[PDB]
Amino acid sequence: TCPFYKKIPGTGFTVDAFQYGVVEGCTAYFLTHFHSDHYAGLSKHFTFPVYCSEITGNLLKNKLHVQEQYIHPLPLDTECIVNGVKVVLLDANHCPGAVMILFYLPNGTVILHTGDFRADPSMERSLLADQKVHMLYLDTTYCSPEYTFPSQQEVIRFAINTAFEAVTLNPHALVVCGTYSIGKEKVFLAIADVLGSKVGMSQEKYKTLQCLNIPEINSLITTDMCSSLVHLLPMMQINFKGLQSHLKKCGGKYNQILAFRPTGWTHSNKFTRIADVIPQTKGNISIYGIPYSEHSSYLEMKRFVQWLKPQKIIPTVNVGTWKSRSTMEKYFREWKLEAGY
């Protein structure tokens, strides 16, 4: 059965609630983004209205075969009426297609559901500027001060310079980048662009990227592995064994691999600056772990919430333990006393 923090009071609506069967009195199911924990349950057999972005709609149709009659895409930054209630979708700065949802309740209450998001000062100049929010349903993935990481721009700078240096020293090196879902596409796109190559991948991954409305995509990716010196592989294969095995298949074109594993936060963030990061190396294979986050740092989260000044906060991540829930409630009270709302 569907938990409370996925229901929107005073509406027939749920958010990211497809794994519970038929939800009593749900007339429209919202999906914030195409990540498996959130879409869990959708398929070609689903027969209720799904509301989402255009990009999420492309993935539902082509990857999950959801029938077209039940896909309701909405434009961003635009007031829309759904089942007699005003809603707006806003960019979440998460993965492609990810939204936040503003609901304007018939009784005068305003609710923001962040989905998964990476808070940014640019959100203080969206349609959120205009008015009050009474309840915030918040992506609390990294709600603790130990969670620090650099900007996406610094991480990409590090990856481009690392790849360009290595391939200029050795023109016979191959670059490999891990993936297991959408998001983080800038890692492999920026590397390929500096190297003057398309990105090679499987047919299944090429299909997924074709759903994402990335400009000039046909100029950036390919299924012809032989033509490309930046390859994508599933994340589970980014290890000394998997990469040895991959190099065998390239037909003596390459004598070295340099690989990247994007992660979220890891404990080596607690000591080592992005500049100072070093790889793990065995023979002619080197693997860099790089902390490319699509969720708010503690400081970014705190900034956003202090600016918005919500009356109540409902966390949507780390809700399963008493210690987690208690820790989060203490931070929300400090933020409120410090800023005076």
Site of interaction with Ni ion (CB under 5 A): 35, 116
CB of 118 to Ni ion, least distance (A): 10
Q: In this complex, which beta carbon is closest to Ni ion, that of residue 52 or of residue 195? A: 52
DSSP 79-126: -EEETTEEEEEEE-SSSTT-EEEEEE-TTS-EEEE--S----GGGGGS
Residue 120 vs residues 22, 127, 299, 314: alpha-carbon distances, Å: 36, 14, 10, 20
H or E element, residue 290:
strand 285-291
Which residues lie closer than 8 Å to 226 by C-beta, 6 or more apart?
Answer: 251, 253
Q: In this complex, which beta carbon is closest to Ni ion, that of residue 37 or of residue 334? A: 37
CB of 341 to Ni ion, least distance (A): 28
Q: In this complex, which beta carbon is closest to Ni ion, that of residue 266 or of residue 281? A: 266
CB of 94 to Ni ion, least distance (A): 6
Q: What is the dihedral of CA 280, 151, 154, 55, to 10 degrees?
A: 90
Closest to 333 in 3D by CA, of 307, 305, 295, 308: 305
Residue 226 vs residues 149, 163, 171, 193: alpha-carbon distances, Å: 36, 19, 15, 17
Q: In this complex, which beta carbon is closest to Ni ion, that of residue 32 or of residue 197? A: 32
Q: What are the structure tokens assigned to 62, written together?
A: 């082509």
CB of 92 to Ni ion, least distance (A): 9
Residue type, 253: K
Surface-to-core class of residue 107, CB atoms within 10 Å of its CB (0-12 exposed, 13-18 middle, 19+ buried):
exposed
d(CA 174, CA 68): 41
CB of 45 to Ni ion, least distance (A): 24
CB of 166 to Ni ion, least distance (A): 31
Residue with tokens 């594993």: 261
Contact (Cβ atoms closer than 8 angstroms) between residue 84 and residue 229? no
CB of 152 to Ni ion, least distance (A): 15
d(CA 108, CA 133): 10
Q: In this complex, which beta carbon is closest to Ni ion, that of residue 116 or of residue 300? A: 116
Q: In this complex, which beta carbon is closest to Ni ion, that of residue 35 or of residue 184? A: 35
Q: In this complex, which beta carbon is closest to Ni ion, that of residue 57 or of residue 200? A: 57
CB of 338 to Ni ion, least distance (A): 29
d(CA 75, CA 87): 11
Q: In this complex, which beta carbon is closest to Ni ion, that of residue 116 or of residue 185? A: 116
